[PDB]
């Protein structure tokens, strides 16, 4: 003949089954996306590692050194034509001798 549907430890083992049932419920209700959202064959990788110098990118560099002496030209004309800043004072007025000439 069994013990009662009525002991304190029987109620505590039902209380444990209830705490687990609340866990299975919250843990389900929060809606995490499941495993295998990306490919399971999606291997580990490295970072980006962008090109280094070679012979051909060296010879573009010798032509960059060329395009640099014409960039010296394109800088002076940079001032003459890309810069559109108005004068402070007139080309002949700036040379009036009892004050400093100021471009």
Swiss-Prot record:
Would you kindly state one Gene Ontology biological process term found in this protein's UniProt entry? negative regulation of delayed rectifier potassium channel activity
Subcellular location, in the record's words?
Cell membrane; Cytoplasm; Perikaryon; Cell projection, Dendrite
Give the Cytoplasmic compartment stretches of this protein.
78-103
Tissue distribution of the protein = Expressed in hippocampal neurons (at protein level). Widely expressed with highest levels in kidney and moderate levels in small intestine.
InterPro entries from the entry? Answer: K_chnl_KCNE, K_chnl_volt-dep_bsu_KCNE3
Q: Name one GO cellular component term.
A: cytoplasm
| UniProt region (Disordered), positions on chain | 32-53
* Keyword annotations from UniProtKB, A to Z: Brugada syndrome, Cell membrane, Cell projection, Cytoplasm, Disease variant, Glycoprotein, Ion transport, Membrane, Potassium, Potassium transport, Transmembrane, Transmembrane helix, Transport
Q: What is the effect of changing residue 83 to H?
A: Found in some patients with periodic paralysis; uncertain significance; alters voltage dependence, lowers current and diminishes open probability in KCNC4/KCNE3 channel; lowers current in KCNQ1/KCNE3 channel
Annotated region Interaction with KCNQ1: the residues are 68-79
Q: Which GO terms describe its molecular function?
A: potassium channel regulator activity; transmembrane transporter binding; voltage-gated potassium channel activity
Residue ranges annotated as transmembrane are 57-77
The membrane topology noted for this protein in its Swiss-Prot or TrEMBL record is: Single-pass type I membrane protein
The task this protein performs is described as: Ancillary protein that functions as a regulatory subunit of the voltage-gated potassium (Kv) channel complex composed of pore-forming and potassium-conducting alpha subunits and of regulatory beta subunits. KCNE3 beta subunit modulates the gating kinetics and enhances stability of the channel complex. Alters the gating of the delayed rectifier Kv channel containing KCNB1 alpha subunit. Associates with KCNC4/Kv3.4 alpha subunit to form the subthreshold Kv channel in skeletal muscle and to establish the resting membrane potential (RMP) in muscle cells.
User: What is annotated about its quaternary structure and interactions?
Assistant: Interacts with KCNB1. Interacts with KCNC2. Associates with KCNC4/Kv3.4. Interacts with KCNQ1; associates with a KCNQ1:KCNE3 stoichiometry of 4:4; produces a current with nearly instantaneous activation with a linear current-voltage relationship and alters membrane raft localization; affects KCNQ1 structure and gating properties.
* Recorded disease: Brugada syndrome 6: A tachyarrhythmia characterized by right bundle branch block and ST segment elevation on an electrocardiogram (ECG). It can cause the ventricles to beat so fast that the blood is prevented from circulating efficiently in the body. When this situation occurs, the individual will faint and may die in a few minutes if the heart is not reset.
- Family from the record: Belongs to the potassium channel KCNE family.
Q: What is this protein called?
A: Potassium voltage-gated channel subfamily E member 3
Species source reads Homo sapiens (Human)
User: What gene makes this protein?
Assistant: KCNE3
């Amino acid at each position: 003949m069994e013990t009662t549907n009525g002991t304190e430890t029987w109620y505590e083992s039902l209380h444990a089954v209830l705490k687990a049932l609340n866990a299975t419920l919250h843990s389900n209700l929060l809606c995490r996306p499941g495993p295998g959202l990306g490919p399971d064959n999606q291997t580990e990788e490295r970072r980006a590692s962008l090109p280094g110098r070679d012979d051909n990118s060296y010879m573009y560099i010798l032509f960059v050194m060329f395009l640099f002496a014409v960039t010296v030209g394109s800088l002076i004309l940079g001032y003459t034509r890309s810069r559109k800043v108005d004068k402070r004072s007139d080309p002949y007025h700036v040379y009036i001798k009892n004050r400093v000439s100021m471009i």
